[PDB]
């Protein structure tokens, strides 16, 4: 588990990691309080 | 008045990821990447 | 098909010697043979 | 109960004899 | 009185 | 199929029976020694008991 | 005491090393020695 | 001034990420000495490497051989190593037992393989009042590890040297008999009784209270 | 007693293929129950002696460690004064599954257990195997895909172990039935010394046998071997077994006596096994001899290639002895006596490479996160099984770097392009919570400082912070191998903390009735059977 923390510390921190991405283009103020949905309703509707 | 044949039980048992697709998931080949196994419920004393 | 035609390759004296070796070893360790799983035999359900 | 305690003690003795294997005897 | 093995 | 199969099976069956017979004899032979040993120990205890009674004759 | 005297079988490898008298061609790629070597190497 | 002191935490982060990302106990030393440095933070490097050894759950020979590789360079790393040894000896009170085990295994690797000189051990003193249980188990682990690394005859030849005699007066006491008997009780308690051989109770007539 | 068709197919490991047997589900439930019952009753009735491996008490690296300790703890194992020799031979019992006679198997199974169970097992091994349009009845050999086949083969292999050792030596090694010996221990030194065969183990079908020869018995063995099979042209050295990965000085030349003793040991062991049952072939063998000439003991168990160097050979610094080295002790003098040097065998470097190749061929039509997940599983399995030997082995590190490169290249080819500037390490090695691929790394991947800056918008200005300006040093991607405790230290702490647990159990049962969960918090994640 500790690897996760260190690899964030290796990559320049959460601020740098998220500023590679479109995090600031989403209108989200802070990274805490977020989650990723594994699949949308369209994907689970078309699986079978 | 029949209690019946008793049934057994199975032996024990920044949030999320992008996902592996709904067809390429097959069955849950994305576990806890760090450690094996489902976490075990722990008794305090023996 | 070759085993059906050309017989058991383990000859009779070899099989007898192996059987008697197993017999002497098993009586030397005082091995109690495994019974059939009985009708009640509580541990059954846990094994199941 | 006593039966579950006996089987759990058998498990604990099994884990001990798996851990103590090679050094005392 | 000798057997013939399958690989031989 | 080859004839040897029959001979093969015959040997095992005879061997099996022979092994059982041997085991039984050895088993019963063992229990003879067992009961004999028990009798010997009992006899020794009886002798010791007599000596204890003799010591009781020394006690009174 | 000879150290190998309780051994059940003695001398089980006489004539096994005699293979190689003359390398012989069999016109059957399913029964040639190359196929047997190949399929014993791979199908484990 | 740097009250938040960001340069120190940046140096500590680079040393920690350099150690925690090598494989062999020579890659870490090679990158660590490849690292640039202001005129002095080598005490900080020694503090960070020993602290990173202490925070591990189980001791490994990797960081011990890393410390050995730094200790076979010039005199500055060596003298910093006995300064760190003395500092961790006198500042032992708040550290957990497993961390003390890691520190003792590291320093047993250092002393056992000639990484630092066999003369700092005069810091070790055997008295009732000035020794805590944490220092006591530190001493137990340290001599057990040196026993494991070298052996009985090697330690017998090491501690029996006459040139080491002024440096071992803090451990092998010969002046006050209560400390000697306390050393007897402990060295018989952890099976170091063969090392308690240079002493002699009967011929010491200075404390002859009993006939 | 009459059963259904059993499907058969092949599983492809790219170097070998193995048959996989698909059995009818209701018979699968019956066989699973029978399998569990037979293993439980065999354990309680003490069917299997200590050498029957894999036992439920060791991980395979602990098995290799215990084998090294059992080698090191023998009497005068590293002495060579009277010209004595040590021979360790590792070999694989060929065609044991193919050559099981089902009538003899039925008889031996009738010996150990009830005749109904034996009849069920033998009737279960005689089924029709079908693959597509091909179908045949299997009347010779055992089916390795039945649930209880593990127990049946361990019993048959126990009988083969009796045939190799002999009943007297097997009884001496296994110990008396009232108090059986532990793994690689004897009752006293007289029992250990009496026979040349000092150690023995069988992992399913691979036997490791360790023999100690005095001068006269070794001379008699070599004399018998050259009497039976003479070779006066020094052609015995052509085709012998020795490991090439060990360095140009650590491996020495093989003389007349060493090669002759190795071939004699192999021939004597081959003379014990009936070829109608099983055999050991010379190509599957590896024999190494410890003598006065070469002070090295070579073997390879469960994928660890182990070279043992006793410390009574480096008295004049013969060899460096500075690596990821298991340090072997003697249980008599309680001091360090030998060193074990670990490598990963090239066969298992190939197994890891073949696993990554399987990943890249089963997953062209899959997502990037699936590639990273499968890669993580493969890398974690490798590094948590091998630990020290993965770090020591150079070829394994090269293979790991190439396979990680192939995984990243598969992601790149997925996007469209293989352009290195387009892919910082932050794309791959970011944890999956932040949207990254979550790959774990086992390679030396430096991160340039251009990935350590960030912008922030405020009401009086916009701040473009550039962290790490005071350094000209790049921070490095954390190696996975620095987060996995090495095996030797883990075994040592396991022994120590289990002795501690027995201590607290003894002074706990003379007090409270149950041990709490506060006195064992320090001892929580310790022990190979974790506490």
Coordinates of N, CA and C in Angstrom, one line a residue, chain H residues 6-7 10-14 16-25 27 31 34-37 52 55-63 65 68-69 97-98 101 105 113 147-153, chain I residues 322-327 329 333-336 339 391-392 397 443-444 452 467-479 481-486 488-490 492-493 496 500 522 525-526 530:
Chain H
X6 N 12.1 24.5 3.4 CA 11.7 23.6 2.3 C 12.9 22.9 1.7
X7 N 14.1 23.5 1.8 CA 15.3 22.9 1.3 C 15.6 21.6 2.0
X10 N 13.1 19.0 0.9 CA 13.4 18.5 -0.4 C 14.6 17.6 -0.5
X11 N 15.7 17.9 0.2 CA 16.8 17.0 0.3 C 16.4 15.7 0.9
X12 N 15.6 15.7 2.0 CA 15.2 14.4 2.6 C 14.3 13.6 1.6
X13 N 13.4 14.3 0.9 CA 12.6 13.6 -0.1 C 13.4 13.0 -1.2
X14 N 14.4 13.7 -1.7 CA 15.3 13.1 -2.8 C 16.1 11.9 -2.3
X16 N 15.2 9.9 0.3 CA 14.3 8.9 0.5 C 13.8 8.2 -0.8
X17 N 13.6 9.0 -1.8 CA 13.1 8.5 -3.1 C 14.3 7.8 -3.8
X18 N 15.5 8.2 -3.5 CA 16.7 7.5 -4.2 C 16.9 6.2 -3.5
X19 N 16.8 6.1 -2.2 CA 17.0 4.8 -1.5 C 15.8 3.9 -1.9
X20 N 14.6 4.4 -1.8 CA 13.4 3.5 -2.0 C 13.2 3.1 -3.5
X21 N 14.1 3.3 -4.4 CA 13.9 3.0 -5.8 C 15.1 2.4 -6.4
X22 N 16.1 2.0 -5.7 CA 17.2 1.2 -6.2 C 16.9 -0.3 -6.0
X23 N 17.8 -1.2 -6.4 CA 17.6 -2.6 -6.2 C 18.7 -3.3 -5.4
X24 N 19.9 -3.0 -5.6 CA 21.1 -3.8 -5.2 C 21.7 -2.9 -4.1
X25 N 22.4 -3.4 -3.1 CA 23.1 -2.5 -2.2 C 24.4 -1.9 -2.7
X27 N 23.6 0.1 -6.0 CA 22.9 1.1 -6.8 C 22.6 2.4 -5.9
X31 N 23.9 6.1 -6.8 CA 23.1 7.3 -7.0 C 23.2 8.3 -5.8
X34 N 26.3 10.1 -6.3 CA 26.1 11.0 -7.5 C 25.3 12.2 -7.2
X35 N 24.6 12.3 -6.1 CA 23.7 13.4 -5.8 C 24.6 14.6 -5.4
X36 N 24.2 15.8 -5.9 CA 24.9 17.0 -5.6 C 24.6 17.4 -4.2
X37 N 25.5 18.3 -3.6 CA 25.3 18.7 -2.2 C 25.8 20.1 -1.9
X52 N 15.4 5.9 7.9 CA 14.8 5.0 6.9 C 15.0 3.5 7.2
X55 N 12.4 2.8 10.2 CA 11.0 2.7 9.9 C 10.6 1.5 9.1
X56 N 11.6 0.6 8.7 CA 11.2 -0.6 8.0 C 10.6 -1.6 9.1
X57 N 9.7 -2.4 8.6 CA 9.1 -3.4 9.5 C 10.0 -4.5 9.9
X58 N 10.8 -5.0 8.9 CA 11.8 -6.0 9.2 C 13.2 -5.6 8.6
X59 N 14.2 -5.8 9.4 CA 15.6 -5.4 8.9 C 15.9 -6.3 7.7
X60 N 16.7 -5.6 6.8 CA 17.2 -6.3 5.6 C 18.7 -6.0 5.4
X61 N 19.4 -6.8 4.8 CA 20.9 -6.6 4.7 C 21.2 -5.5 3.7
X62 N 20.2 -5.0 2.9 CA 20.3 -4.0 1.9 C 20.8 -2.7 2.5
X63 N 20.1 -2.2 3.5 CA 20.5 -0.9 4.0 C 21.8 -1.0 4.9
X65 N 24.3 -3.0 4.2 CA 25.5 -3.0 3.3 C 25.6 -1.6 2.7
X68 N 27.5 0.2 5.2 CA 28.9 -0.3 5.1 C 29.6 0.3 4.0
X69 N 29.0 0.5 2.8 CA 29.6 1.1 1.7 C 29.9 2.5 1.9
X97 N 10.3 -0.4 20.1 CA 11.3 -1.5 20.3 C 11.8 -2.1 19.0
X98 N 10.8 -2.2 18.0 CA 11.2 -2.7 16.7 C 12.2 -1.8 15.9
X101 N 15.4 -2.5 17.3 CA 15.9 -3.8 16.8 C 16.6 -3.5 15.4
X105 N 20.6 -3.9 14.6 CA 21.1 -4.8 13.6 C 22.0 -4.0 12.6
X113 N 31.8 -5.8 10.7 CA 32.5 -5.9 9.5 C 33.5 -4.7 9.3
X147 N 27.3 -11.4 17.9 CA 27.5 -12.8 18.1 C 27.2 -13.6 16.9
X148 N 26.1 -13.3 16.2 CA 25.6 -13.9 15.0 C 26.6 -13.7 13.8
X149 N 27.1 -12.4 13.7 CA 27.9 -12.1 12.6 C 29.3 -12.7 12.7
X150 N 30.0 -12.6 13.8 CA 31.4 -13.0 14.0 C 31.5 -14.4 14.6
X151 N 31.0 -14.6 15.8 CA 31.0 -15.8 16.5 C 31.7 -15.7 17.9
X152 N 31.7 -16.8 18.6 CA 32.2 -16.9 20.0 C 33.7 -16.6 20.1
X153 N 34.5 -17.3 19.2 CA 36.0 -17.1 19.3 C 36.4 -15.7 18.8
Chain I
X322 N 29.5 -11.2 -1.4 CA 28.8 -10.0 -1.1 C 27.7 -9.8 -2.1
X323 N 26.5 -10.3 -1.8 CA 25.3 -10.2 -2.6 C 24.0 -10.4 -1.8
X324 N 22.9 -10.7 -2.4 CA 21.7 -11.2 -1.8 C 21.8 -12.7 -1.4
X325 N 22.6 -12.9 -0.3 CA 23.1 -14.2 0.0 C 22.4 -14.7 1.3
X326 N 21.8 -15.8 1.2 CA 21.3 -16.5 2.4 C 22.4 -16.9 3.3
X327 N 22.4 -16.6 4.5 CA 23.5 -16.9 5.5 C 23.1 -18.1 6.3
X329 N 23.5 -21.1 9.1 CA 24.1 -21.3 10.4 C 24.1 -22.8 10.7
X333 N 26.9 -25.3 17.0 CA 27.7 -24.2 17.5 C 27.0 -22.8 17.4
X334 N 25.9 -22.8 16.8 CA 25.0 -21.5 16.7 C 25.8 -20.4 16.1
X335 N 26.6 -20.7 15.1 CA 27.4 -19.7 14.4 C 27.3 -19.9 12.9
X336 N 27.7 -18.9 12.2 CA 27.6 -18.9 10.7 C 28.6 -19.9 10.1
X339 N 27.3 -20.0 3.2 CA 26.5 -19.0 2.5 C 25.9 -19.5 1.2
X391 N 16.5 -9.7 -7.5 CA 17.4 -8.6 -7.4 C 18.8 -9.0 -7.8
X392 N 19.2 -10.2 -7.4 CA 20.6 -10.6 -7.7 C 20.7 -10.9 -9.2
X397 N 16.4 -8.9 -14.4 CA 16.2 -7.4 -14.5 C 16.1 -6.9 -15.9
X443 N 11.7 -1.1 -12.8 CA 12.8 -0.6 -13.6 C 13.2 0.8 -13.2
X444 N 14.4 1.2 -13.5 CA 15.0 2.4 -13.1 C 14.6 3.5 -14.0
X452 N 7.1 18.6 -12.4 CA 7.0 19.0 -11.0 C 6.6 20.5 -10.9
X467 N 8.3 23.3 -8.4 CA 9.0 22.6 -7.3 C 10.3 22.0 -7.7
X468 N 11.1 21.8 -6.7 CA 12.4 21.1 -6.9 C 13.5 22.0 -7.6
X469 N 13.3 23.3 -7.5 CA 14.3 24.2 -8.1 C 15.6 24.1 -7.4
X470 N 15.6 24.0 -6.1 CA 16.8 23.9 -5.3 C 17.6 22.6 -5.6
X471 N 17.0 21.6 -6.2 CA 17.7 20.4 -6.7 C 18.0 20.5 -8.2
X472 N 19.1 19.9 -8.6 CA 19.3 19.5 -10.0 C 19.2 18.0 -10.2
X473 N 18.5 17.4 -9.2 CA 18.5 15.9 -9.1 C 17.0 15.5 -9.4
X474 N 16.8 14.5 -10.3 CA 15.5 14.0 -10.6 C 15.1 13.0 -9.5
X475 N 13.8 13.0 -9.1 CA 13.3 12.0 -8.3 C 13.0 10.8 -9.1
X476 N 13.1 9.6 -8.5 CA 13.1 8.4 -9.2 C 11.8 7.6 -8.9
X477 N 11.3 6.9 -10.0 CA 10.1 6.0 -9.8 C 10.4 4.9 -8.8
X478 N 9.6 4.7 -7.8 CA 9.9 3.7 -6.8 C 9.9 2.3 -7.3
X479 N 11.0 1.6 -7.1 CA 11.1 0.2 -7.4 C 10.2 -0.6 -6.5
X481 N 10.6 -3.7 -5.7 CA 11.4 -4.6 -4.9 C 11.8 -4.0 -3.5
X482 N 11.7 -2.7 -3.4 CA 12.0 -2.1 -2.1 C 10.8 -2.1 -1.1
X483 N 9.7 -2.7 -1.5 CA 8.6 -2.7 -0.6 C 8.2 -4.2 -0.2
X484 N 9.1 -5.1 -0.5 CA 8.8 -6.5 -0.3 C 10.0 -7.0 0.6
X485 N 9.6 -7.5 1.8 CA 10.6 -8.0 2.8 C 11.3 -9.2 2.3
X486 N 12.6 -9.3 2.3 CA 13.4 -10.4 1.8 C 13.0 -11.7 2.6
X488 N 14.8 -14.3 3.8 CA 15.6 -14.8 4.9 C 15.3 -14.1 6.2
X489 N 15.1 -12.8 6.1 CA 14.7 -12.0 7.2 C 13.3 -12.3 7.7
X490 N 12.4 -12.6 6.7 CA 11.1 -13.0 7.0 C 11.0 -14.3 7.8
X492 N 13.5 -15.6 9.6 CA 14.1 -15.4 10.9 C 13.1 -14.8 11.9
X493 N 12.4 -13.7 11.4 CA 11.4 -13.1 12.2 C 10.2 -14.0 12.5
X496 N 11.4 -16.2 15.3 CA 11.5 -15.5 16.6 C 10.1 -15.1 17.1
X500 N 8.1 -16.4 20.5 CA 7.5 -15.4 21.4 C 6.0 -15.7 21.7
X522 N 2.1 -5.8 18.5 CA 3.4 -5.8 18.0 C 3.8 -7.0 17.1
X525 N 1.6 -8.7 11.9 CA 1.9 -9.1 10.6 C 3.3 -9.8 10.5
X526 N 3.5 -10.8 11.4 CA 4.8 -11.5 11.4 C 4.5 -13.0 11.4
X530 N 1.3 -16.4 9.2 CA 1.0 -15.1 9.9 C 0.2 -15.3 11.2

